[PDB]
Symmetry: D2
Subunit: 431 residues, 4 copies
């Protein structure tokens, strides 16, 4: 049983709480799209752990590669190179679009954003950073200074030169031009204000292609391109944080490929490490060369460690070899249609959005007023859990609660159907 | 051969440079205290990779535990608990001194410092951070804002409320009182200035027990205690960054045990993960409770991931089981005496300092003037490498170059002797 | 002649340039609504010097009071009181609306804003300041940190927690709601963004009732009230900077009286000193009491100096005694109608706005496109000068050039007519 | 009587308190070295009001010049020049040392420091400012960010890049080198720390030649020169704030003349306006030219106003014409010897320091321990007042209370003797 009193005693005595609440179960093992509690119950993992396990849990190939290296090349002095490192960097330059040439291999998502931000500052000689008002880039200093969906209060001043602009949100539009939601006009208006506040030290704009924690907000058609131009006009770099979008999830290897806009620096992490801590930034040779002449520094313990690099390479291999990017579109489409069917059945489902296998369901009181359904989201979530489906909801001011659905790229048709049934049931009991 | 032209071609084209310079060899495999290049040559690793591999490379136990978990519980939604996580947190509360009760398990050293700093700010409601002028706490925002041995220029303003004071350095004393280096008087004088600059928002002091990158500077007798009192009087927390000192390296499980001073928050990382990316903070229950009521947040992808937690637990087991803390004193003593013998033989060795198996050798022009020997350090380093010994030197303004010696806790008598011979030879050729 | 070569030689050698350009004439004397060059030519002063001389130049009463005091009570230790000081403070509490009780008498406009800002920070225990994106509050640190119409670039970072929102501008509206310029909806939208960026340290909003340097922008109907509520909901103070609007200029003793909204702190300066350097803040007793218990400090050399205080009291007397606030409406109305007649005659006049005797004329290429007429403004200005009328234009990005008209409250019907004729002529020659 | 209940009623109801406490008397008039209360009692003004009235109160010449201008050229549009302005700027270039060429005429001391600081930032392209830990430069933002003797707590973060170093204090030395107070070694040590904290954006050092509010601390022999070199090596400007030292007070026209070190920017105010609000900065032509090409801006209402400029010119004339700088040395010497005699008589007088007519007396418990005499200072001060002598004491942590003595340059032998007798008596009653 999950009730192991010694286990819960120690958990209460010895863990630091760091957000949210601990599920009242003890995860014993995990395989593929499921995890198992201490009673042996299988929970369908619709979030791929913490949005990372694109190949599912304990993927046999990952398992072999991990075994191989643990026993042969584990960790090294940060100035020593090895194959897995060079292969992975090379691999990355190759599958990213042209203009993305050189890579740096780190450990976490925030770390990858900090490295990108530091580099932008170094090459521009400026320090002001702009992000979206519902972003999430990490808990470390600079990453946090650009994170706006939460965490800003009580922890002292943010970094000097931190600015946010509203993200374009079609579902709940707030900016009109001729009885129309003109999100590009909104962009202009936003920048104008920025320009007027800047000290003249604009270094970069950092952005997620789809705001995940922000509520699965997809940047609409043309936005990105337009965004890129705003930067270029201002001599700013564009940093795209693809921690949740990269490596196939949205139906392209990388989300920026969809818009055909290549950022100056691209950052990766969650899905790249598929559960392990590996992260990266990729930039152009020109930018790298300049950072280098300027003395760019970002020296860590695990930068360029072989084991993790090895794991990342295998993940890419598998994705490619198995056409998992394409699978993402097929399963994604299967899941989306199901969600849409639920939305036919239940009024509280106000919207279903997203791409590929990174989907959002916004819970609402009523589809007409689009009024946030408070408490209801949490109910459903609990019912899912009882039913054996692991879900995640995010709640922002002025928005209904949003389920963030992100099953493994390896998920099966069945598993999709199952989740879909569990969710319907959960909604039914929760009303 | 290490000359693989395709390998070097790709390395040049696709890697981001991030400090220092790449060794011109290709590391193929690693085992115990050695690494091997592509020609099969064995290099004695006197720095334990990047100062982490306390059990050496590819330790059989680490290898099994890694295997076990990769295949059974890899990575989870950050709100789900599992045994390895609870066991490790518990284990940590138990081997740390009283007052250190609750743990948070993360991935990197900087991340662990950011979490500690954020928490200090939250519980104090203040934001000013003080560190040593030769410190190194990490490359991420806040960690970097408190890092003074390098990296401060060209990357924009540091965090608001960043202050440093001089670290007590007995080898090159600068503060006198009655013809004596009164490092405590220096401390008072330092604080007075701080007090006068503060906006009245002093939150914490962050410190390494032994400044590693700072040049292996050991806090002298009574300093720490006195430091702790300065904080307490000011309502500040004391955060001890034991990334390189923890887990046995200096001859005690933790360096603070030596002084018998328990910090408010303790951070760990390098040696705890023994090569893998695992890190942690440990605090008192009271502090944790308060952070919790205040809404402390530090939610990441890999916080509380089972695999790494599992690895950390095994590392602790092994250390304990094999009396490696005690071994650290014995080998350390064997290594220190050797260094001292070299210092008898060569004038350019100005000082040998450190504790247990974390030792420093400061290179000097002449023992009397204690004038920095410029270029000489680098020579020696290169000669070592040719000879098959991997070393590391750090160079600060106003100080001679310092070799940072940190062989695995598992290092053998032979391996020690060998390194000692290689180094003598290297110094000989380099003169 | 104005050509005095020694005079210009010295001017070139010994003055620091500090913005704009020196008129090529030598002002020898001034009286009433005119100034005289070295050739004895009379220039009609339509800006009341630098927007201050509400009683005109060298007003006989000011002249007597100045004489009186220079000879009897000039300047004192800042802890000694005298009558003029107490009378003026009292006078101020009395003519300001209820809720405005206690005064502090300083020297300049920026100084008065700094004192208000410091006090807001002290009583709220917070530090974030919000202003308008086209504001001007002064050249000193904090005042400058909240000044957005110009001066932000090249001089380092602004104060931490500086934010701006767009000012409501009816002439060139940018925010629509149902095919309408919904300036209140714009306000909401603005605040939402602020809220999301704040660290939770909102202390005050600072605002001019009519943005003078911003282009004579009048806060539309209901805005202020709504603004005040946004603050109150957030626990922020409202500081109204009435440097150019106070003391009768807009047809009420103080502009806030028109909206019937009383700010938390009111600041005055230009018109209060009528040419001399006197300035003030007025606040509620409650706010003052609290600032006092918290140790509010703002100790200067000239705070509470008798001479200037004496001058301010006389200015108020005269204004009251002569019904100059009422005169402001009558002359203002005479001037406005004239401007409107010009606008009938010339296409380049796009708008005439303002209140009482603080009027703006926006120069435009064509009334339909409302396209900024570049160069034209400057022409006109030069022609005015030749014609003997002193004018001032301000130019902001995205706006046509704006003449800022602000003749003395003592201006005569004739003088108005004259200026009106000179301006027509100037426009005629300039086309 | 000073008891006017209506007067005190209004004072209590309508004044904002801003530091310190109001003397319980009503100053009715002032003349020469005295002020008179409402009972007609004459108080000898040993602080020249608030340290400004170098020609005493109501000096007949000041009075005429003031009269002249009030009636002829009072205040102008900031872009119009006039003679008094050009004459004064010229005059200033001429009496300052070579290298000081161009002037900007403002209103207050803080304003003058803000203008200097802004300009330093503009020309260096950097923003970090260093001052003394016991300085006082003003209450406005930047001036306050560099003020360390008081006011830093409770009002939010200071300006980014604010640093202080200890001022050299011979009376209570804290830095030793070979059993000697090596204040220059202290300077080096200080800078080293600064260097290590800087982001590489050092713009200027701002300093008072004698720290007035800091406790009448005189920069010892060679310090300044050495300080200037530290700056020059770092590419920083040196700004000397001579608000209390300029215009004769210390026995030279300007204090920097004594050391023969010319700062990059010199600021003046108190004594220059001799009671009226006038202030200035003086810089080199090169610096000015560069600030100008970079768009230096510092446009205020009263910059370049004729009346005040006129007053400043007269003050200079008088000082020169009457050899008041020389008089300062003679009277200063008469006053100093008296103080020394008191120090013979009373143990509580620990030190008498200063120069010319800017003298300090530090009150101590006992001359041997040099222990601060708490409460005693305040007693004496009160007794002086009863006796008819106006004095001022400043109290800093770790220092005894310090009387700041600064009688007018026009003070008479008698007046000196008188004060000297009153003070002796006051000390006698107070023991
Ligand atoms: C000084 C650079 C070096 C990489 N040190 C890293 C380091 C970190 C950061 O850990 P990270 O986040 O990098 O994992 C935290 N605390 C201390 C005391 C450290 O020495 P090393 O000393 O090993 O060379
Ligand atoms: C929003 C909180 C969550 C943990 N996200 C983390 C996250 C990180 C940080 O990675 P880390 O440093 O934590 O590894 C970086 N960039 C994006 C777009 C993210 O969503 P998630 O979305 O998965 O719940
Ligand atoms: C220390 C407080 C006192 C008012 N000093 C004011 C002061 C100012 C400010 O001038 P302000 O802007 O105030 O006119 C600038 N520089 C120095 C060296 C000063 O001592 P004082 O010393 O006279 O008591
Ligand atoms: C905009 C530049 C001008 C000089 N304005 C100065 C100004 C000040 C500063 O007063 P200062 O400290 O300068 O005395 C404060 N508040 C407002 C609304 C102002 O317009 P003006 O509008 O008169 O041209
Ligand atoms: K490494
Ligand atoms: K996790
Ligand atoms: K005063
Ligand atoms: K002026
Ligand atoms: Na690419
Ligand atoms: Na413990
Ligand atoms: Na009132
Ligand atoms: Na000169």
């Amino acid at each position: 049983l999950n009730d192991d009193a010694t286990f819960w005693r120690n958990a209460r005595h010895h863990l630091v709480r760091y957000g949210g609440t601990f599920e009242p179960m003890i995860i014993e093992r995990a395989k593929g799209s499921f995890v198992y509690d201490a009673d042996g119950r299988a929970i369908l993992d619709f979030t791929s752990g913490q949005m990372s396990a694109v190949l599912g849990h304990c993927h046999p190939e990952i398992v072999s590669v991990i075994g191989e290296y643990a026993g042969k090349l584990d960790h090294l002095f940060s100035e020593m190179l090895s194959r897995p490192v060079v292969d992975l960097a090379t691999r990355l330059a190759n599958i990213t679009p042209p203009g993305l040439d050189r890579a740096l291999l780190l450990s976490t998502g925030a770390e990858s954003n900090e490295a990108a931000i530091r580099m932008a500052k170094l090459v521009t000689g400026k320090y002001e950073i702009v992000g979206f008002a519902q972003s999430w880039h990490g808990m470390t200093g600079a990453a946090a200074s650009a994170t706006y969906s939460a965490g800003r209060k009580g922890v002292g001043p943010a970094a000097v030169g931190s600015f946010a602009i509203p993200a374009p949100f079609t579902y709940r539009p707030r900016f009109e031009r001729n009885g129309a939601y003109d999100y590009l006009a909104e962009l202009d208006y936003a920048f104008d204000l920025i320009d007027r506040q800047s000290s003249g030290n604009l270094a970069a704009f950092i952005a997620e292609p789809i705001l995940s924690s922000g509520g699965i907000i997809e940047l609409p058609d043309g936005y990105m391109a337009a965004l890129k131009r705003k930067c270029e006009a201002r001599g700013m770099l564009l940093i795209l944080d693809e921690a949740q979008t990269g490596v196939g999830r949205t139906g392209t290897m990388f989300a920026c490929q969809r818009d055909g806009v290549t950022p100056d620096i691209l950052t990766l992490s969650k899905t790249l490490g598929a559960g392990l801590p590996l992260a990266a930034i990729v930039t152009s040779a020109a930018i790298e060369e300049r950072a280098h002449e300027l003395g760019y520094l970002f020296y860590t313990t695990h930068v360029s460690d072989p084991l993790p690099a090895a794991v990342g390479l295998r993940v890419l291999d598998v994705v490619q070899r198995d056409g998992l990017v394409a699978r993402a579109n097929v399963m994604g489409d299967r899941l989306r249609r199901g969600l849409l069917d639920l939305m036919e059945r239940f009024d509280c489902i106000g919207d279903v959005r997203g791409r590929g296998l990174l989907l959002g369901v916004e819970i609402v009181k009523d589809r007409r007023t689009k009024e946030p359904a408070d408490g209801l989201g949490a109910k459903i979530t609990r019912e899912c859990m009882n039913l054996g489906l692991s879900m995640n909801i995010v709640q922002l001011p002025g928005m209904g609660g949003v389920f963030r659905i992100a099953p493994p790229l390896t998920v099966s048709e069945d598993e999709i159907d199952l989740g879909l049934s569990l969710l319907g049931q959960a909604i039914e009991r929760a009303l």
